[PDB]
Design a protein around this ligand. Structure first.
Ligand SMILES: CCCCCCCCCCCCCCCCCC(=O)OC[C@H](COP(=O)(O)OCCN)OC(=O)CCCCCCCCCCCCCCCCC
Ligand SMILES: NC(=O)C1=CN([C@@H]2O[C@H](COP(=O)(O)OP(=O)(O)OC[C@H]3O[C@@H](n4cnc5c(N)ncnc54)[C@H](OP(=O)(O)O)[C@@H]3O)[C@@H](O)[C@H]2O)C=CC1
Ligand SMILES: CCCCCCCCCCCCCC(=O)SCCNC(=O)CCNC(=O)[C@@H](O)C(C)(C)COP(=O)(O)O
Ligand SMILES: CCCCCCCCCCC1=C(C)C(=O)C(OC)=C(OC)C1=O
Ligand code: SF4
Ligand code: SF4
Ligand code: SF4
Ligand SMILES: [Zn+2]
Lengths: 208, 297, 114, 48, 176, 95, 146, 156
C-alpha cells in the first residue's frame, strides 16, 4: 500500500490518545467522549456547561497551551434532538498540535460565550448566531454579521432552502429595492447522486 | 386560448400572466408605471419606442428575461404599428404630448396616431384595446389639446368598438406635470374645481381593465376621491414644498374644471381604492424641499 | 423538561421583556419615520409594530419569547443606529407585492396553491 | 495558417461573422424543444 | 530557519550620524525614489496595442462554449448528460429523444453563459469531445438573453470555430 | 436541410417551430431566429456504408483518443447494416 | 407504459357550447356559472352523476355531497355490481375478502367468470406464485383463457 | 436638409467626446476587481483609451459592476447608480453580475445586477479576462458612437 495510500502517523496517534486520556481525567465533570481519528486528530466531546472550564484549561494549562482559537463552527444535524454541534478548533503553538472541542445545543438552550477565553470568538459565535440561530449568552455584541439587515431565518440550517424565501429587485414605482417572494426562472435541479451500494464496510451501522 | 398564454406561477416576476401587451407611448409618465406593474406579473410587454434607446433603459429592470421587447416604430408608419401589434392580445395607447412640435401637432398625436393604432390592432385580431383620453375632452373646449383628444376618442370608439376608453382627470405622481408644474411655477387663482388622481390608481385601473372582460366597450372616468378648488390646491402644493416652460394651452387646461360624469364608471367599478392627495403629496414634493390639508368642495 | 433558561424564568418576566421592547419600538417609530424620511405616517408604523407583536401572540414558551425579544432588540438596534437603509425598514410594508387571493374561489381561479 | 493550414471540413463556416450583438443579426434565445402536452381538439361537427 | 526583518541598531559614531542627518536634511532617499521613477520613464512600456495586438494565450484557454462534430458532419453529443451532471453552476440543461433515424441525440442543449463559471468541467467530463470550451473571449453582448445559448447557438459556435478548436485539442489532448 | 413553416419561420433540426398564433414569435420580430443549417441526420446519411470482411468490426470515430470510446459492432444481420451507437457510421459484412 | 397517454388528448381548459353548438374555450367563472345555473334549476331525480373508472374518493364524496345538497341520490358508477340482497351495505360481499396475499395461504382456488391474467395481472401473478411454490389447485368457470 | 446635417455632425461631435473620455466607476465587489485592475495594468492600460483608472464616482460615466452583487449591497449599488450624472452606462462584468453566476441559487445573491440597474454591456466570464473586459469597453464605445440624440431630437 505504498504509493497511493496516505501513510499513517502512529506516533501522533499515540500521543494524541494519551493527551485525550489526560484531558478526560483532569476534567471528568464535562468530558463525555474522547476520540482520535485515523488521520490523527483529537476530538474532545464535552457537556455544554463546561465550555468555559474546558477551553480555559486548554488555553492556560502548562501541558496544553492552546492559545490560538483557529475556528469556531456550528454544524446542524437535524436528526439529533440537540441538533447544533458547536465545534472549537484550537491550536497549540508550544506543543505544535491541534485539538477539537465539540459540544451541543438545540434551538432554545443557550451556549455560554467564550470571548472571555478567546477574543477571536467574538465574530465567530456571532456568525453562528447569524447562520444557525444558536444564542450565545453573555456576549458583548451579539447580532447578525453576514446576512442582510431585514433577514428572517438562519440560512445554514438544513431545513432552510438553498435559494431562500425572499429575493430582491429594484422597483421603479416606489424608487426602492424591494423584497418579494422568491421565484426561479430555472429551478435548482436536485440530483439524487447516492449509490445504492455500500461503499465503506468499516463504517457500517449495526441494524436494529 | 393558446397553451403558451395560459397563466402560470404565483403572479411574480418569473410567472406567466398570459397578458401580451403592446404599450404605445411607454416611455412616458404613465407608460413607466404601466410597464412596471405589467412586468411584475410576468407579462410579455412590447415597447415600441420612438426615442433614443438610452431613454428606454429604465424599462429593462421592470421584467424578467425576454419579457420586454423593444422595437422601433413611427407614428405615421402602419407597417411598424402592425409589426408591434400582430402578436399582442392587448394594446394600450399612451401616446400624448402637452405641447405641439414642428412635426407632430395635437391632431397627429391625438387623432391620427390613435386611430391608426386602433385600426391596425383591429385588423390584427387584437382582442383588447385600451385608449387614454382626458376627462375634460370636449369638442367645444377652449384648448386644442382637449378638442383633438375628444375627436380622437370619437375615432377610436368608431374604429375599435370594444375598446376601453379611460378618462384620467389630472394625474399626479413623482414624474407628473401637475404637482411638479405647481412646485416650479412659483398660474393664478380662479373658480376652477379639480379632482386629481394618483398614478398608481390609474395604473391599477388600467390593469384591472385588462383583466376584467366587462370593461370591453366601456368608458371609464378615473378621478380622485376629493374635489379641490384650484387656488387652495396650489397653496397646498406650495405649503408641502415649503415654498412661499409654459404655454397658453397648458393655461387653458389648468383653468378648465374637472367635469363630473356619474354615468361613467370609475376606479371603484374596477375595484381600485382612490388614493387622496394628502398621502402622496409628500412623496411627490419631498424633492422640492430645500401642513394643514387642502379644503375640499 | 428541566431546561436552562435564556433570560426569563417564567412567562411573567418574559411578558415584562415583551412590554419593554414594545415601549422601545413605540418611542422609536417617530424617529424612524423622520430620519429614514419614510412615506408612511407615525400611526401607520405604530400599527405595523402592533401587527408584528400580535403576530407572535400565541407563544407560551418562555425561552421562545426570550429569543423573540432578543431578535426584536436586534431589529431595533439596526433601526436606531442607521444600519438599515430605507428599503430594509419599508420591507415590513409589502407594497410592491400583489394582494394574494384569500378565499377558496379566487385561489381556485389563479392556480393550484391551497 | 499560410504555413500550417487548418484541417478542412465541409461544415466549417466559409464566411466568418464578427460579433453581431446590437444588430438585427443578433442571437435571440428560444426553446428548441417541441410542445409536451398535446391538447384535446374538440370536434368541429355538432353534437345533436 | 528564520530571519529578523528590522532588527538593526544604527551606528552612533559621528560618521553614521552625519550620514543619517544628511539623509534627513538633503532628502537622499527621496532623490533615490525620483531616480527609480525616472528610470521607468525611459523604458519601453509594456502596453500592447489592443485590438490590433492580442494578449498571449495557450491552447488550454477556456472561453466560449461550442458543440462539435465528427469529420462527417455528425454531431458528437450523444445526450449522456455527464456535462450537466458535473456542471458546478448547473448552467447546462439537456433534453433528449431518439431522432428520426433512431440515434441518441439531444433536442435541448442549453448553456446559460451567465451561470457558467468557465471551469471546463464539461469538456473534461465529455466522453466524445462534444462540448468543448473554445478560444473565443470576445463575445460580450448588449442584452442578457443573448448569453443564454441554446443548441443552435452552440452548434454555430462549433461550426464557426472548429478550424481552431480542433487544432487546440490536437495540441493539448495528450495531456488529457 | 432546413425547411420552412407557412409562417415563414425556419424549422430547426429538432423539428421546433413556433405556431402561427404563438406570441413568442415576437422575439424574432426585427431580429433573427438563429438555426444551424447543417443537419446531422442528413450529413451522416451521406457517408457510405463501409464494406468490411470481418464478422465483428470496431469503431472509435477516427483519431484514436480524439474520437469516442471503441465499440465493437456485430454484422451478422444481412438485412440491416451495423450502425455505431456513437458516431453513426454504418458497416456491412461483404459476404 | 401507459404514461404517454397522460400527455396526449388532455383537457386543459374549460369548454362550453357556443351559439353554433361547438365546444369553445372559456374561463372557469363562465363554465362553473353555467353549470351552477342549471344545477340550481334541478331537484330530485333531475340531476344525476356517473363516476368513471379513474376517479378518486375525494371527488366521489365531493360530487355525492353536492348532489345531496340538491336532494339527489342518483349517483352511479359505470361498472355494474348487483344490488340485490345486502348489495353494497356490507363490505364483505364486494371485496377481495381473503387478501391478495391470502392466495399464498390457499390450497384450492375457484375462479368464476374472470380472466385474472388481464383484469388484474398481479393478482394473477400471485396465483401463479402460489401455483408454483405451494402446489395450488386452480379451477376456472368461464372461457378457457390462457 | 441643412438642419439634419448640422444635428448629425453635432451628434458625431458629442458622441466622439463622450466615448473617447469615458470615466469609469468600478464596483470592485469580488474577483472581477482583480481583472479590471489588470485591465488598468500596463499591458492592457485602459488609460490610453481615455478611460481613466480610479475616476471619481461623483463624475463617472460608466459604472463597471465587477463582482457578485449580494442582497445586502443591492441598495448601495442602486444608490451609487442614482448619484451618477447622465449619460450613465453600466457594464456588467462577469457571471455573478450578469446572472448570479456560481451563486445563482444562493439565498443572498441578486441574480444578476440587471434586476437592480439597467445594463448596457454584459461581459461574460468567471472572470472575463482583462482583454475581454477591454473588449466590452470598446463595444460600449461603439454603442455610444451610434447614438442619435440630436437626430431623434430633430425628428420629434
Ligand atoms: C455646417 C458644418 C458644421 C456643423 C457643426 C459641426 C461643427 C464641428 C464639430 C467637429 C467636427 C464634427 C465631427 C466630429 C468627429 C466625427 C467623426 C468621428 O468620430 O470619426 C472617428 C475618428 C476616430 O475613429 P474612432 O471611431 O475613434 O476609432 C477608434 C480608433 N481606431 O475620430 C477622429 O479621427 C477624431 C475626431 C475629432 C473630432 C474633431 C476635433 C475635436 C473638436 C474641435 C472643435 C470643437 C472643440 C473646440 C475646443 C473646445 C475647448 C478645448
Ligand atoms: N397627468 C398626465 O400626464 C395625464 C395624461 N393623460 C394622457 O395620458 C397619456 C400618457 O401621459 P403621459 O405619460 O403623462 O405623457 P408623456 O408625454 O410623458 O408620454 C407620452 C408618450 O408618448 C410618446 N410620444 C409622444 N409624442 C409622440 C409622437 N409624436 N410619436 C410617437 N411617440 C410619441 C412619448 O415617447 P417619446 O419619449 O419617444 O416621445 C411618451 O412615451 C397621454 O395621452 C396624455 O394625454 C391624461 C390625463 C392626465
Ligand atoms: C417600522 C416597523 C417596525 C416593525 C418592528 C417589528 C419588531 C417585532 C418585535 C416582535 C417581538 C415579539 O414578537 S415578542 C411577543 C411575543 N410574546 C408572547 O408570545 C407572549 C404573549 N404576549 C402577549 O399576549 C402580549 O400581548 C402582552 C403585551 C405581553 C400581554 O398581552 P395579553 O394580556 O393581551
Ligand atoms: C478645460 C480642459 C478640461 C480638461 C479636463 C481633464 C480632467 C482630468 C482627466 C484625468 C484625471 C486626472 C489626471 C486626475 O488627476 C483626476 O483626479 C484624481 C481626475 O478625476 C478623477 C481625472 O479624471
Ligand atoms: S465550463 Fe463549467 S460552469 Fe461552464 S458549462 Fe462547463 S461545467 Fe458548467
Ligand atoms: S457530456 Fe458530451 S456527449 Fe454527454 S450530454 Fe454533455 S456534450 Fe453531450
Ligand atoms: S463572475 Fe466569477 S470570477 Fe467574476 S467576480 Fe463573480 S465569482 Fe469572481
Ligand atoms: Zn463510431
Amino acid at each position: 500500500t505504498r504509493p497511493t495510500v496516505r501513510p499513517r502517523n502512529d506516533v501522533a496517534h499515540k500521543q494524541l490518545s494519551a493527551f485525550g486520556e489526560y484531558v478526560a481525567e483532569i476534567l471528568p465533570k464535562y468530558v463525555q467522549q474522547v476520540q482520535v481519528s485515523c488521520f490523527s486528530e483529537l476530538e474532545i466531546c464535552i457537556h455544554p456547561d463546561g465550555v468555559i472550564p474546558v477551553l480555559t484549561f486548554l488555553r492556560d494549562h502548562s501541558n496544553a497551551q492552546f492559545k490560538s482559537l483557529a475556528d469556531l463552527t456550528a454544524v446542524d444535524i437535524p436528526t439529533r434532538q440537540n441538533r447544533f454541534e458547536i465545534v472549537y478548533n484550537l491550536l497549540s503553538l508550544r506543543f505544535n498540535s491541534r485539538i477539537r472541542v465539540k459540544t451541543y445545543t438545540d434551538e432554545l438552550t443557550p451556549v455560554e460565550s467564550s470571548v472571555s477565553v478567546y477574543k477571536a470568538a467574538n465574530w465567530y459565535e456571532r456568525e453562528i448566531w447569524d447562520m444557525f440561530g444558536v444564542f450565545f449568552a453573555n456576549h458583548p455584541d451579539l447580532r447578525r454579521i453576514l446576512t442582510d439587515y431585514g433577514f428572517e431565518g438562519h440560512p445554514f440550517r438544513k431545513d432552510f432552502p438553498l435559494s431562500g424565501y425572499v429575493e430582491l429587485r429594484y422597483d421603479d414605482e416606489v424608487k426602492r429595492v424591494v423584497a418579494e417572494p422568491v421565484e426561479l426562472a430555472q429551478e435548482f435541479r436536485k440530483f439524487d447522486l447516492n449509490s445504492p451500494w455500500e461503499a465503506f464496510p468499516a463504517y457500517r451501522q449495526p441494524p436494529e | 386560448l393558446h397553451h403558451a398564454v395560459i397563466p402560470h406561477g404565483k403572479g411574480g416576476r418569473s410567472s406567466v400572466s398570459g397578458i401580451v401587451a403592446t404599450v404605445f407611448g411607454a416611455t412616458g409618465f404613465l407608460g413607466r408605471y404601466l410597464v412596471n406593474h405589467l412586468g411584475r406579473m410576468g407579462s410579455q410587454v412590447i415597447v415600441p419606442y420612438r426615442c433614443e434607446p438610452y431613454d428606454t433603459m429604465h424599462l429593462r429592470p421592470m421584467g424578467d428575461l425576454g419579457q420586454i421587447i423593444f422595437m422601433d416604430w413611427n407614428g405615421r408608419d402602419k407597417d411598424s404599428i402592425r409589426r408591434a401589434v400582430e402578436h399582442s392580445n392587448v394594446v394600450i395607447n399612451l401616446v400624448g404630448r402637452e405641447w405641439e412640435t414642428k412635426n407632430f401637432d395635437f391632431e397627429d398625436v391625438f387623432v391620427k396616431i390613435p386611430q391608426a393604432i386602433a385600426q391596425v390592432s383591429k385588423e390584427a385580431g387584437v382582442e383588447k384595446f385600451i385608449h387614454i383620453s382626458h376627462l375634460n375632452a370636449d369638442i367645444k373646449s377652449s384648448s386644442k389639446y382637449l378638442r383633438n383628444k375628444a375627436v380622437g376618442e370619437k375615432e377610436v370608439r368608431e374604429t375599435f368598438p370594444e375598446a376601453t376608453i379611460i378618462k384620467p382627470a389630472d394625474i399626479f405622481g413623482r414624474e407628473d406635470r401637475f404637482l411638479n408644474y405647481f412646485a416650479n411655477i412659483r398660474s393664478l387663482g380662479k373658480k376652477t374645481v379639480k379632482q386629481p388622481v394618483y398614478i398608481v390608481d390609474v395604473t391599477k385601473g388600467i390593469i384591472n381593465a385588462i383583466k376584467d372582460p366587462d370593461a370591453r366597450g366601456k368608458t371609464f372616468a378615473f378621478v380622485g376621491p376629493n374635489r379641490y378648488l384650484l387656488f387652495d390646491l396650489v397653496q397646498y402644493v406650495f405649503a408641502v414644498a415649503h415654498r412661499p416652460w409654459t404655454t397658453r394651452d397648458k393655461v387653458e387646461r389648468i383653468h378648465t374644471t374637472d367635469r363630473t360624469l356619474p354615468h361613467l364608471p370609475g376606479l371603484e367599478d374596477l375595484g381600485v381604492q382612490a388614493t387622496p392627495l394628502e398621502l402622496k403629496a409628500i412623496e411627490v414634493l419631498r424633492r422640492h424641499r430645500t401642513v394643514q390639508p387642502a379644503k375640499t368642495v | 423538561t428541566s431546561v436552562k433558561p435564556i433570560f426569563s424564568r417564567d412567562m411573567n418576566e418574559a411578558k415584562r421583556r415583551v412590554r419593554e421592547l414594545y415601549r422601545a419600538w413605540y418611542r422609536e417609530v417617530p424617529n424612524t419615520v423622520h430620519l429614514f424620511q419614510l412615506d408612511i405616517s407615525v400611526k401607520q408604523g405604530r400599527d405595523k409594530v402592533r401587527e408584528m407583536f400580535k403576530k407572535n401572540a400565541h407563544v407560551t414558551d418562555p425561552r421562545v419569547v426570550d429569543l423573540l425579544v432578543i431578535k426584536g432588540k436586534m431589529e431595533l438596534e439596526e433601526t436606531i443606529n442607521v444600519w438599515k437603509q430605507r428599503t430594509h425598514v419599508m420591507r415590513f410594508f409589502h407594497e410592491t407585492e400583489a394582494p394574494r387571493p384569500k378565499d377558496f374561489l379566487s385561489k381556485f381561479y389563479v392556480g393550484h396553491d391551497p | 495558417p499560410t504555413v500550417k493550414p487548418p484541417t478542412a471540413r465541409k461544415f466549417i463556416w466559409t464566411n466568418h461573422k464578427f460579433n453581431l450583438s446590437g444588430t438585427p443579426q443578433q442571437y435571440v434565445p428560444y426553446s428548441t424543444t417541441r410542445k409536451k402536452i398535446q391538447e384535446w381538439v374538440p370536434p368541429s361537427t355538432p353534437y345533436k | 530557519t528564520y530571519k529578523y526583518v528590522n532588527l538593526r541598531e544604527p551606528s552612533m559614531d559621528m560618521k553614521s550620524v552625519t550620514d543619517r542627518a544628511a539623509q534627513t536634511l538633503l532628502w537622499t532617499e527621496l532623490i533615490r525614489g525620483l531616480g527609480m521613477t525616472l528610470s521607468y520613464l525611459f523604458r519601453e512600456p509594456a502596453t500592447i496595442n489592443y485590438p490590433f495586438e492580442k494578449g498571449p494565450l495557450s491552447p488550454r484557454f477556456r472561453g466560449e462554449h461550442a458543440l462539435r462534430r465528427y469529420p462527417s458532419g455528425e454531431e458528437r453529443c450523444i445526450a449522456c448528460k455527464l456535462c450537466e451532471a458535473v456542471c458546478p453552476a448547473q448552467a447546462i440543461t439537456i433534453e433528449a429523444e431518439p431522432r428520426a433515424d433512431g440515434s441518441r441525440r439531444t433536442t435541448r442543449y442549453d448553456i446559460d453563459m451567465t451561470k457558467c463559471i468557465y471551469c471546463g468541467f464539461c469538456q473534461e467530463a465529455c466522453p466524445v469531445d462534444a462540448i468543448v470550451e473554445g478560444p473565443n473571449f470576445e463575445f460580450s453582448t448588449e442584452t442578457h438573453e443573448e448569453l443564454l445559448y441554446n443548441k443552435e447557438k452552440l452548434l454555430n459556435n462549433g461550426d464557426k470555430w472548429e478550424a481552431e478548436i480542433a487544432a487546440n485539442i490536437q495540441a493539448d489532448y495528450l495531456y488529457r | 436541410g432546413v425547411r420552412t413553416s407557412p409562417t415563414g419561420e425556419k424549422v430547426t433540426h429538432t423539428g421546433q417551430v413556433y405556431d402561427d398564433e404563438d406570441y413568442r414569435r415576437v422575439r424574432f420580430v426585427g431580429r433573427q431566429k438563429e438555426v444551424n443549417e447543417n443537419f446531422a441526420i442528413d450529413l451522416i446519411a451521406e457517408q457510405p456504408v463501409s464494406q468490411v470482411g470481418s464478422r465483428v468490426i470496431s469503431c472509435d470515430g477516427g483519431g484514436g483518443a480524439l474520437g469516442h470510446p471503441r465499440v465493437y459492432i456485430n454484422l451478422d444481420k444481412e438485412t440491416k447494416t451495423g450502425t455505431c451507437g456513437y458516431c453513426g457510421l454504418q458497416f456491412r459484412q461483404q459476404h | 407504459f401507459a404514461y404517454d397517454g397522460l400527455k396526449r388528448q388532455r383537457l386543459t381548459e374549460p369548454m362550453v357550447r357556443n351559439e353554433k353548438g361547438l365546444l369553445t374555450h372559456t374561463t372557469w367563472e363562465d363554465a362553473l356559472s353555467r353549470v351552477a345555473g342549471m344545477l340550481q334549476s334541478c331537484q330530485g331525480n333531475d340531476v344525476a352523476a356517473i363516476a368513471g373508472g379513474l376517479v378518486d374518493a375525494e371527488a366521489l364524496i365531493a360530487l355525492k355531497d353536492l348532489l345531496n345538497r340538491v336532494d339527489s341520490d342518483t349517483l352511479c358508477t359505470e361498472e355494474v355490481f348487483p344490488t340485490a340482497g345486502a348489495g353494497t351495505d356490507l363490505r364483505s360481499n364486494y371485496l377481495l375478502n381473503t387478501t391478495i396475499a391470502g392466495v399464498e395461504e390457499a390450497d384450492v382456488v375457484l375462479l368464476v367468470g374472470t380472466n385474472p391474467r388481464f383484469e388484474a395481472p398481479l393478482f394473477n401473478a400471485r396465483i401463479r406464485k402460489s401455483w408454483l411454490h405451494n402446489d395450488l389447485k386452480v379451477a376456472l368457470i368461464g372461457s378457457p383463457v390462457d | 436638409s441643412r438642419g439634419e446635417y448640422v444635428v448629425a455632425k453635432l451628434d458625431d461631435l458629442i458622441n466622439w467626446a463622450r466615448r473617447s473620455s469615458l470615466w469609469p466607476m468600478t464596483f470592485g465587489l469580488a474577483c472581477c476587481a482583480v481583472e479590471m485592475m489588470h485591465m488598468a495594468a500596463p499591458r492592457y492600460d485602459m488609460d490610453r483609451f481615455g478611460v481613466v483608472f480610479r475616476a471619481s464616482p461623483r463624475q463617472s460615466d460608466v459604472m463597471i459592476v465587477a463582482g457578485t452583487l449580494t442582497n445586502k449591497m443591492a441598495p448601495a449599488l442602486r444608490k451609487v447608480y442614482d448619484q451618477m450624472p447622465e449619460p450613465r452606462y453600466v457594464v456588467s462584468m462577469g457571471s455573478c453580475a450578469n446572472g448570479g453566476g456560481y451563486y445563482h441559487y444562493s439565498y443572498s445573491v441578486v441574480r444578476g445586477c440587471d434586476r437592480i440597474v439597467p445594463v448596457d454591456i454584459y461581459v461574460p466570464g468567471c472572470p472575463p479576462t482583462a482583454e475581454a473586459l477591454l473588449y466590452g469597453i470598446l463595444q460600449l464605445q461603439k454603442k455610444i458612437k451610434r447614438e442619435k440624440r440630436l437626430r431623434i431630437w430633430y425628428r420629434r
